[PDB]
Design a protein around this ligand. Sequence first.
Ligand SMILES: Cc1ccc(CN2CCS(=O)(=O)CC2)cc1
Length: 435
Amino acid sequence: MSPNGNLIRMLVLFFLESELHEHAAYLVDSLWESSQELLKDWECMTELLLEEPVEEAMSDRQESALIELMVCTIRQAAEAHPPVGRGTRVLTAKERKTQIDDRNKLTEHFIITLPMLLSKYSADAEKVANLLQIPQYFDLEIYSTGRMEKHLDALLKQIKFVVEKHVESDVLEACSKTYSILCSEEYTIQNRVDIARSQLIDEFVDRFNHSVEDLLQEEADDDDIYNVLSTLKRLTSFHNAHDLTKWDLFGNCYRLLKTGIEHGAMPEQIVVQALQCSHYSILWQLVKITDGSPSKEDLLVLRKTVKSFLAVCQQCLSNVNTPVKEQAFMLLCDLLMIFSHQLMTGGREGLQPLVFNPDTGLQSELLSFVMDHVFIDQEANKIEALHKRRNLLAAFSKLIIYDIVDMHAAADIFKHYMKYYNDYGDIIKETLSKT
Ligand SMILES: Cc1ccc(CN2CCS(=O)(=O)CC2)cc1
């Protein structure tokens, strides 16, 4: 109890203080055989985190490590398998019984205590994004069973306060995914969560629409920019996993982008998010059309939308801010792939009107960005910026393979940048072999 408390406290210390475990998941996984009993004392963990001291209080860094360790243990108990990259899969009857009981214990426990945890740590973006990894492991049927509706309300309350207080893509994304999980995985509670969700969306769609109108009718206050950006981030975040097409967000994202192109002066992060939000609106318009039985005008309306947006992402390659150029680029390669001829596969040849072959102008510009932003002359940030330029190349690589761009003009650029490997590589290879 206070014994298990000492062990968990020293465990958080050994993790933080040694460089002997870099990943919490890996430490937990390694101690799992020997210390499963300790590592699932979740009452002890939430107590440490929620109670005030008498004494010796936890530091902010230890609080954070304890949450990350707690969530790793919740995953291991619920999944009953090592974490990704310690895998090698069949459970014994006793492991299956322990998995069921463990899921039951953590579900009953964290349904009650996750609201209290979110409440206390509501400001700390890292901690909240960690704490919201938890409900994905819930046995959601218990929200009915244990007459625990009071605690579902409690969570939705605290998710609302979190979404309202924050703009970090991590946090917003954890809220978005957590609403997804609560909704479409149990009918009893679906109806209640849908209401809390759509109410939350309405409040943000109002704030966004009022902020857009402020910004555009204006010379523009720093408040006008914060208001648009902050509300748009929430809606973009959610628009990935929630179909928000009933709110015409595309229209206002389009105006934000059309204004910034025209008067040249839209803040980079408003352009980037407006781009992402518009893209997510289109993907969702497309899903509703594939699955429905769409009329001729239904298709031709989505066509006009996609053409004006391809045109916006085209013009956005010429914006000064490289984050914009990269977003515009990534969406161009996505969209030109999606609205290729592939679309007409699976007897779906009704969709011909939605196909788009990029013109030469666009292919040339999708060639330039590669030359300018994938192939550049010149710690942690640089291995992250490399994998991104890899994604940007791979994304572009797909348009080459299917001849959506000039597949020859592209290979020439690959010759030009590989030259020093085809001219001196053999000599460099054998030399480095013998050292
Ligand atoms: C939102 C936004 C889009 C594009 C630009 C770039 N600007 C317009 C394209 S251009 O070549 O006509 C002159 C440069 C700026 C802002």
